[PDB]
Symmetry: D2
Subunit: 248 residues, 4 copies
């Protein structure tokens, strides 16, 4: 029983590092052609080159700043000149602009909404063509346990991660007749190189909230995304899969 | 067992008609001073006057266009010159721009998020002062059953109604230490004057999804808001109360 | 705005103390006739008398052991010889038999299910007659936040509290056409006399999980039950109201 | 990227037909040794023989009537004489005893609870030994969309399917420190040979509730169970994965 994606093209936004990069590497490991995006076109192309060398797949990197509608449509013009179209979309790009509510600036609130909700809206609208035409497509939106539980200092981020669930369920209903499945993965506390700036004390505090007693790895999140893009998830749509070690 | 709000001041956005107006009248019937808002200041002041004559409460109407930060600030400058501060905030104002996803324009999407999420954000930030200082306050966010089930033609609206849940849960956590409770009410299918433009045909349809076999009235939603503003809801925060006749 | 239940008859199981008693007193304070039940008929009649003297309502106490179908039937035979019928049922009686799963005996498991689910089933079947005939009735099931989050040492109890949600949602659908509303209240950590046997140590701990920073009182849970039995909850059915200070 | 279970032993209850048989065949297809159970030991051994011939795996059939604690412990004595122990448990066995509530017999209620909750409790307790010892184990409980939405005529079944979620989350927390993951799969409307007795009319009615517009196949449910038993689900525990074509 193997999962193979040879012949498919996957676009993973915000994949020059962290969870997004693990997701693109995981899809590449299953045979998928992959499109890497980052706010830096140079870094995106560099990462795409590394992934192609490591797994031997066709990979392309494009600059895409989800704060700009122009940057997004422009990245897609480049994308459609490189591939026939997109079969799999993983809306991973997302930002935080943390601040206690009473003092959150309008810009901190709006940028988070602009990238996490509007950027996801635009990227998804631009990726549907081939999927609807062939009646096969997979869209996976990366949400967060915080969109379900709420989190102090992240009212903007939590609002968007919960909003993505409404986005996922509504879009899944609209696209279901075309066999394009739309789902969400909600990671809990995942270890990335950024976790390195946390004090041992704060980290143990977070781990205490986790029944498995450990942070998950980016690859463990990527594995669930891979499952949703596989033939094993053909009857799942409009669903959220929590990957948080038992925390919620 | 009496629910009384005499001495309290309630701001209900988008209350010149529909559910918003029913909420403002319900709070006034319990003795609350009320602030009515609408895109038409003239209309808001007129409604405030009718409510004041009907229930005998102190009422004020102010123009507030949630799409405009300047309008919001100007409304609050007027409010704080009329009232000592706000004890109760009901975030009811919201819009829909229904379109199938494949037919949705960036403005159809951005306008709905700007009013429903960003307008709610700004109104809430501006209404907290008195609640926090006195360690008592109630914020009720009006979501919708479609933020939970998703709905065809409403990917934008459903995203915002789901987003208000993450907003509610996160804000509830940040303000809980100050005893300011933040909850949401998620109405199902409610009969308003906007409902008459639908066929008796399409209405019987919608009713098919409702176990109680009938649409709810605006007053039935308003009654739940009243409950959340009362002493009976003193240990409830970060919660969503579904008022949908058993459909979800 | 007055919540009055004069002329209504409420059966509250397991109401000789704790949350059950607070619920019965709260309903009596709104004018309801109340029926108190306990494993000790003598104790139930005594409590009924105290409540009757304190609020001036018609109150009756009956012995009801939910583990025993014969006890249940005998209690209802007595009830229908004292009251015309039941308008409001609060399924509050329940037990815990805490054990780590690997240490749980079949009786630790079966007793908890027999009382919490099967006893609730039988009491409810026996209380519907008047509600159905008159097209008005309210059934409130007391669940618990652990039925939602799960809890170590409580696999049996959590199974029953989660089960009461499916019970509530299904029964709500079957009775909705008759206007008999079925809802659940899921208290978080509530301070009762059973609480004093815990260390100030372990209590401060539990409080750590609570945003409001305090345990709720039995009266705060009772107030929510009262709300569900009032005219303010006429469009709510098949719903769970969490009363946990923001923990879930 | 392949999923292989060679060397592992999987017990699937109620696997002589339908979804349970698809699940056992799917695990066998990935290389797992499989234990088939049914109320008829003869049919269980026959199915096990067929699966072993089709996939070439070690397979064993045992009679197990979940209505009897004696039958269950006895099946396990046979099981432990055939395999070192159990690495994967799929609690699939479940029954319905449909009846409108007001007229449901106590036996219809209790049998459903006895098999779906108590049988699952006992089977799970008997299967943990090897898992806890080696710090690797996967338990998958088959729930149902009806445990979440409720369903007319199935208050007993819905109660148990929702109860299994509390069971899953509590047990996941207790076993997480041992790396034994406990999850649930909630199928929606799945086509089995029993679906053959439904009128074309009723079936179209059900399909109308499904966005994908079709029933899922037993194999599509089995695929999700396989995912949860794979290395791709190593950070998932205490979760429910809905497999219902977008219905909920």
């Amino acid at each position: 029983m193997e999962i193979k994606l040879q012949g498919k093209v996957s676009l993973v936004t915000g994949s020059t590092r962290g969870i997004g990069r693990a997701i693109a590497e995981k899809l590449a490991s299953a045979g998928s052609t992959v499109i890497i995006t980052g706010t830096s076109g140079e870094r995106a192309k560099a990462v795409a080159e590394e992934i192609a060398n490591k797994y031997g797949v066709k990979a392309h990197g494009v600059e895409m700043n989800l704060l700009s509608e122009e940057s997004i449509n422009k990245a897609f013009e480049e994308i459609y000149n490189l591939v026939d179209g997109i079969d799999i979309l993983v809306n991973n790009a997302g930002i935080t602009r943390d601040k206690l509510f009473l003092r959150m600036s309008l810009l901190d609130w709006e940028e988070v909404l602009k990238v996490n909700l509007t950027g996801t809206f635009l990227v998804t609208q631009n990726s549907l063509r081939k999927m609807i035409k062939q009646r096969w497509g997979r869209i996976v939106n990366i949400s967060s346990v915080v969109g379900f539980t709420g989190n102090v200092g992240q009212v903007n981020y939590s609002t968007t991660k919960a909003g993505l669930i409404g986005f996922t369920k509504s879009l899944a209903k609209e696209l279901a007749p075309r066999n394009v499945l739309v789902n969400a993965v909600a990671p809990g506390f995942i270890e990335t190189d950024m976790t390195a700036v946390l004090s041992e004390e704060i980290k143990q505090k977070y781990k205490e909230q986790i029944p498995l007693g450990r942070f998950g790895s980016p690859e463990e999140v990527a594995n669930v995304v891979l499952f949703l893009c596989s033939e094993l998830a053909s009857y799942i749509t409009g669903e959220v899969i929590h990957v948080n070690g038992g925390m919620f």
